[PDB]
Amino acid sequence: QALPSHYNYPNSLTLKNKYGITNHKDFTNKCAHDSAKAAINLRQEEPPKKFDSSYLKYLHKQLFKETFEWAGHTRDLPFTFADGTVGVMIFATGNKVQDGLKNIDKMLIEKNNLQGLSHKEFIENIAEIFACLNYTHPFREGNGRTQRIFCEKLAQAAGYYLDFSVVTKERMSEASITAAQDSNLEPMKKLFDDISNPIKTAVLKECINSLKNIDHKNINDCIIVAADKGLTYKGIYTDNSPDSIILKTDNIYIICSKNDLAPEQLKTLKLGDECTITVPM
């Protein structure tokens, strides 16, 4: 019998791995390290001429070849381990993996690997590819690390630098869930806009480096987003970093540089108060 359980050690939720490690914490730590060493080397590599699922598979192989026998292989196809057993079987099921990869490949061909596009089209399309990869979940494990590097490389070849380190866990989760369940890509587009705009990335970075907590919660449990030029926000001034105010609105936190606000606007603000901020264009 091919079985999904043949991916794991007997009676365990630990994946079979080239380290022989059954302890889940120890396994996770070692995999994290091996794949982080591979990632740093991949970041420096020349990007490919064409971005497609074969490059995605290459990245997964490079990231996980020291960890998994199946590095570079997709989960829809049975995989035969060296021990003789065969494994099979975050949501596309079966043939849906191949369809998802096909659709991403078609998108990338049609949009010239996202090169030569307007900024708005670059954002709509990289967000859509990230969401499609989410849904496709083509690998047994390591999808997130592989998707991220793929998008980093894609952005690099198009002239942008992506900094995923300014995205909170809560922001990534809510953006991903909303894209998949409500078909709403707006949170994902805003995420990619922030992390590809060096000014917005720096605003978010200074916030993260200054504050462990926002509004009585760990910052990683808060959706924090950069303020956009031209927008008016109304909410509660809940926290203050040296450079920025933090405005709570519709359950999220807008990080607004004090450099973008006028003295008149600044004198107006008191921590805990409701306020209305317009960011100039």
Residue numbers in the entry: 18 to 106, 121 to 312
Per the authors:
Proteins containing a FIC domain catalyze AMPylation and other post-translational modifications (PTMs). Among these, Bartonella effector proteins (Beps) comprise a particularly diverse ensemble of FIC domains that subvert various host cellular functions. The FIC fold comprises eight conserved α-helices and encompasses a characteristic active site loop between helices α4 and α5 that forms most of the catalytic center and the substrate binding pocket. Additionally, FIC domains generally contain a β-hairpin between helix α2 and helix α3 that is referred to as the “flap” and mediates docking of a target segment in extended conformation via β-strand augmentation.
The structures of Bhe_BepA, Bcl_Bep1, Bqu_BepC, and Btr_BepC exhibit all features defining a FIC AMP transferase as described in the first chapter and elsewhere. So far, it has been shown that Bep1 AMPylates Rac-subfamily GTPases, Bep2 AMPylates the host intermediate filament protein vimentin, and BepA causes the AMPylation of two unknown host proteins of ca. 40–50 kDa size. All members of branch 1 are predicted to catalyze AMP transfer (indicated in green in the cladogram). This has been verified for Bro_Bep1, which AMPylates the switch 1 loop of small GTPases. Very recently, it has been shown that small GTPases of the Rac-subfamily are the target for Bep1 and that two residues in the extended flap are critical for the exquisite target specificity. With the use of modeling, this finding was rationalized by suggesting that they form two salt-bridges with Rac-subfamily specific residues. Bcl_Bep1 FIC were grown from a solution of 10% w/v PEG 20,000, 20% v/v PEG MME 5500, 0.1 M MOPS/HEPES-Na, pH 7.5, and 0.02 M each of sodium formate, ammonium acetate, trisodium citrate, sodium potassium L-tartrate, and sodium oxamate. Data for Bqu_BepC FIC with ADP, Bcl_Bep1 FIC, and B11C_Bep8 FIC were collected at 100 K on a Rayonix MX-225 detector at a wavelength of 0.9786 Å on beamline 21-ID-F at the Advanced Photon Source (APS, Argonne, IL, USA).
